[PDB]
Amino acid sequence: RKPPKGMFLSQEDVEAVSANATAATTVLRQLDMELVSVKRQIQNIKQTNSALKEKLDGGIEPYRLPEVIQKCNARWTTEEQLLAVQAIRKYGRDFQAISDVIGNKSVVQVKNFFVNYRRRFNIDEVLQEWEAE
Amino acid sequence: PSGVEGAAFQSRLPHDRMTSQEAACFPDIISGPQQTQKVFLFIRNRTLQLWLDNPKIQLTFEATLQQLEAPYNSDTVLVHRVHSYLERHGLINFGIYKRIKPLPTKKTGKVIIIGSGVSGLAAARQLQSFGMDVTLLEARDRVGGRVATFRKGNYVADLGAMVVTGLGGNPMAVVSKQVNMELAKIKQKCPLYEANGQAVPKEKDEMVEQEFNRLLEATSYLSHQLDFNVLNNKPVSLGQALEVVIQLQEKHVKDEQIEHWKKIVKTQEELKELLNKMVNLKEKIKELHQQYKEASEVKPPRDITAEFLVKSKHRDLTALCKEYDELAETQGKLEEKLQELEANPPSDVYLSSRDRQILDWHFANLEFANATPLSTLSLKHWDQDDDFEFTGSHLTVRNGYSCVPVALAEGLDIKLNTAVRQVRYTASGCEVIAVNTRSTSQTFIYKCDAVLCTLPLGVLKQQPPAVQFVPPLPEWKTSAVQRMGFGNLNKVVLCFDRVFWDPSVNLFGHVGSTTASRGELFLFWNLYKAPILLALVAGEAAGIMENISDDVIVGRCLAILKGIFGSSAVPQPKETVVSRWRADPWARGSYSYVAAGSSGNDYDLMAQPITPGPSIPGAPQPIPRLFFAGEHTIRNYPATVHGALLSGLREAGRIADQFLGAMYTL
Amino acid sequence: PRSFLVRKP
Ligand SMILES: Cc1cc2c(cc1C)N(C[C@H](O)[C@H](O)[C@H](O)COP(=O)(O)OP(=O)(O)OC[C@H]1O[C@@H](n3cnc4c(N)ncnc43)[C@H](O)[C@@H]1O)c1[nH]c(=O)[nH]c(=O)c1N2C=O
């Protein structure tokens, strides 16, 4: 039913190599030329990645900032109420950020905080001014 | 196989079923009740066994019916019919046996046999066994034809047939019991030794051989399952198909390197994109950090829009730092993958100048087996005769294969040095015209009832004709002769004063330098008691080495031998012989092969006898008068001594059935 | 014939 294993003998290839005298050699040369072309591309891209690789030397160790170990809290000092409104102005609804900016409140604290102060802090208008950008 | 059923196998016959030939002679039993068939079949099977256990005394009918038991010894005409059928068709009482019932005083019928090749001798001996007058005409000065055998002192070496290809169902097994033939067994181990002079190592040796056999199977897959058997209106040869398989294997090796590297650039080009995002985040980070030190430089106390600014930048920068960290994460996986992908690169070549030359020696092997360039064999049909291979080891004849024809020749009217120049066959009979090979002027005429032709296919092929047929052979016969293939492979025999090769290896290769010379001295045989080495010239090389002086040929042999064993272990050869079968005008070649565009059916056309036209017009269709035997006539066993012998047995039986009548068909 | 092949597998 099948060849021996490893031998590759589909009908299509056999015609392709029998189509004329030199068809087999001609077909082999195109693969040969094609392999060389891809090989040169590989080296070409190695160079490029090697250049892009040197521009990233040192990583971001100089640009990193120490972690702020801080406990949570549910009292809203007027200060971090104000940080909030501003963060809501800047981040739309991404509570992780607004959590991050405030620092001492969790997404739920931020999340619940929206509804509680919505009337008083006009979070509605702040929100639609976020939309504009 | 053993018992009566073994006799059937040792006689090339199914034990449990009746052959097409038996259905001919016993149509009364094949169409009858299965009971009688099994009787018959047992009745046949036992009979062969009796002949087979003791093939040096004639097996008489009486002796056979003696030794059967009931119910089998009840139908005495069945037993007589069977025993007569067997004796007639050479399955029993053939070869060289003591006759119990001596020859009939007067013979009946006259047959001229052209050639005392083994096919010839075999038939002649059978016809004489049947009470016929039989004369063999022989162009040579010795019998055996292509069973040639050198002798000088104790040196002995066949330039012709040299191996018995197994005793399992071989008629030569019978002959071997019938004549002192020292059969020495051949040890399968054969070290190759490339052009430098040093062994190919097992690792390589085994893998080329493995590829070789794999390559052969592929071709088989091209002809049978892909129907790759015509190409530009011409029949595909085995040689072409081997090239088309190698090419499709060389293409596959490249096709899989391309696939490999293409995966590599897919990752490298996907890594490139990744670095672009990383060298763009490190500058969103550069600028955010700057913006943060500035916003953090404003020492406190500060109003909330300025405190929010520091916190916002601090959040934003952290986000980007997370993001860039998750990408030197990914910049890590890809970097690992790239060493894996490169680390496992697939093969660079299918085969190389080293490989491809040991592979050429396995092709010189094929060429020697079929005595021809692989470009001339039929892809579809070159191996058609392989179902009927014998079982058991392959053997040699320490005293020379000649001793078998010579043995067969005793008791027979043989005219040596008589070359047939013309065969005339008519409705009333035939006349053969021969000359003396020594003095060509002397002319002989032999009149006979029928001519048995065992002329070699190379002879038959000769243009212009070495033997004229009157009237000409019909077209259907002469096209079989063209269409067929008659190949060639010569030998070189090296007689030394001392053994300097491994005496426990019988045969060792030499790997040639070129594809073109793959056959030139590619194999040496150590077969004999005396210190004789025997060298083969096969393939395309065989035809060409015939245009070269022996001295030059022996030089090349000495050079090849010196490289193997050192320039000082290899003495001068005491006696040297190289022949020339293609040049031999009583052979014109070595043996037949299924040429491209031929089939095994052509071997059957060669055996059909010829029946001439009627003398007086309106006369009833006559008897057949020209019969053919020889190696190129036995479809299942071509170019292989038993096959010759078997074909001579065949014609003798069919000529007797014709001129003596069959008293076993009733 | 294919039967003459040396070192048959
Ligand atoms: C080099 C070599 C090696 C091997 C084998 C073969 C070869 C070549 N062969 C083939 C056999 O020779 C063949 O089966 C048989 O010999 C044909 O043998 P065959 O077909 O029965 O007959 P023939 O050709 O031997 O004899 C023909 C006769 O006809 C004569 N003749 C010819 N023209 C004539 C004319 N005009 N007038 C009168 N007589 C004429 C000719 O001189 C000779 O007397 C082997 N066979 C086998 O079984 N084992 C082997 O090892 C080998 N061997 C190696 O492998």
Coordinates of C-alpha atoms and ligand atoms in Angstrom, one line a residue, chain B residues 114-120 137-140 142-147 159-165 368 401 418-421 454-456 459 466-467 489-491 581 584-587 589-591 629-632 637-645 647, chain C residues 4, ligand 1:
Chain B
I114 CA 22.1 -28.5 -32.1
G115 CA 24.5 -28.0 -29.2
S116 CA 25.7 -30.0 -26.3
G117 CA 25.1 -27.3 -23.8
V118 CA 23.5 -28.8 -20.7
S119 CA 20.0 -28.3 -22.1
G120 CA 21.1 -30.2 -25.2
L137 CA 26.0 -31.3 -33.3
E138 CA 28.6 -29.2 -31.6
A139 CA 30.5 -26.2 -32.9
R140 CA 33.0 -26.5 -30.0
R142 CA 34.1 -29.9 -25.8
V143 CA 30.7 -30.4 -24.3
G144 CA 29.0 -28.2 -21.7
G145 CA 29.0 -24.9 -23.7
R146 CA 28.5 -22.2 -21.1
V147 CA 29.6 -24.7 -18.4
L159 CA 34.8 -19.5 -16.4
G160 CA 31.1 -20.3 -16.8
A161 CA 28.4 -21.3 -14.4
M162 CA 29.9 -21.7 -11.0
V163 CA 27.2 -21.8 -8.3
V164 CA 24.3 -24.2 -7.5
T165 CA 21.7 -21.8 -6.2
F368 CA 26.6 -9.0 -12.3
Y401 CA 31.2 -27.7 -13.0
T418 CA 30.6 -29.3 -36.3
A419 CA 29.1 -25.9 -36.8
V420 CA 25.5 -25.8 -38.0
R421 CA 25.3 -23.3 -40.8
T454 CA 19.7 -25.3 -28.0
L455 CA 21.6 -22.5 -29.7
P456 CA 22.3 -19.6 -27.3
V459 CA 23.7 -16.8 -31.4
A466 CA 25.2 -17.3 -38.1
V467 CA 22.5 -19.9 -38.7
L489 CA 29.7 -10.8 -17.6
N490 CA 33.3 -12.2 -17.9
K491 CA 35.7 -13.5 -15.3
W581 CA 31.8 -14.4 -23.6
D584 CA 32.8 -16.1 -28.1
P585 CA 30.9 -16.8 -31.4
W586 CA 29.2 -20.0 -29.9
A587 CA 27.7 -17.8 -27.0
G589 CA 27.1 -13.3 -24.4
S590 CA 26.7 -15.0 -21.0
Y591 CA 23.0 -15.4 -20.3
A629 CA 15.4 -25.6 -25.4
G630 CA 18.2 -23.9 -23.5
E631 CA 18.4 -21.3 -20.7
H632 CA 16.4 -18.6 -22.6
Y637 CA 14.3 -20.5 -14.3
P638 CA 16.1 -18.4 -16.9
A639 CA 20.0 -18.2 -17.1
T640 CA 20.4 -20.9 -14.3
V641 CA 21.7 -24.4 -15.1
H642 CA 18.7 -26.3 -13.6
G643 CA 16.6 -24.1 -16.0
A644 CA 18.7 -25.2 -18.9
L645 CA 18.6 -28.8 -17.8
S647 CA 14.2 -27.1 -20.5
Chain C
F4 CA 22.7 -14.6 -8.3
Ligands
LIG1 C1 30.0 -16.6 -17.2 C2 28.7 -17.3 -16.8 C3 28.5 -17.6 -15.5 C4 27.3 -18.3 -15.2 C5 26.4 -18.7 -16.1 C6 26.6 -18.4 -17.4 C7 27.8 -17.7 -17.8 C8 28.0 -17.4 -19.3 N1 25.3 -19.4 -15.7 C9 24.2 -19.6 -16.7 C10 24.3 -21.0 -17.2 O1 25.4 -21.1 -18.1 C11 23.1 -21.5 -18.0 O2 22.0 -21.8 -17.1 C12 23.4 -22.6 -19.0 O3 24.8 -22.8 -19.0 C13 22.9 -22.5 -20.4 O4 23.3 -23.6 -21.2 P1 22.4 -24.0 -22.5 O5 21.6 -22.9 -22.9 O6 21.9 -25.3 -22.2 O7 23.5 -24.2 -23.6 P2 24.9 -23.6 -23.8 O8 24.7 -22.2 -24.4 O9 25.7 -23.9 -22.6 O10 25.4 -24.5 -24.9 C14 25.0 -24.2 -26.3 C15 25.8 -25.1 -27.2 O11 25.5 -24.7 -28.5 C16 26.7 -24.7 -29.2 N2 26.5 -23.9 -30.4 C17 26.3 -22.6 -30.6 N3 26.2 -22.2 -31.8 C18 26.4 -23.4 -32.5 C19 26.3 -23.6 -33.9 N4 26.2 -22.7 -34.8 N5 26.5 -24.9 -34.3 C20 26.7 -25.8 -33.3 N6 26.7 -25.7 -32.0 C21 26.6 -24.4 -31.7 C22 27.6 -24.0 -28.2 O12 28.9 -24.1 -28.6 C23 27.3 -25.0 -27.1 O13 27.9 -26.2 -27.5 C24 25.1 -19.8 -14.4 N7 24.1 -20.7 -14.1 C25 24.0 -21.2 -12.9 O14 23.1 -22.0 -12.6 N8 24.9 -20.9 -12.0 C26 26.0 -20.0 -12.2 O15 26.8 -19.8 -11.4 C27 26.1 -19.5 -13.5 N9 27.1 -18.6 -13.8 C28 27.4 -17.7 -12.9 O16 26.7 -17.3 -12.1

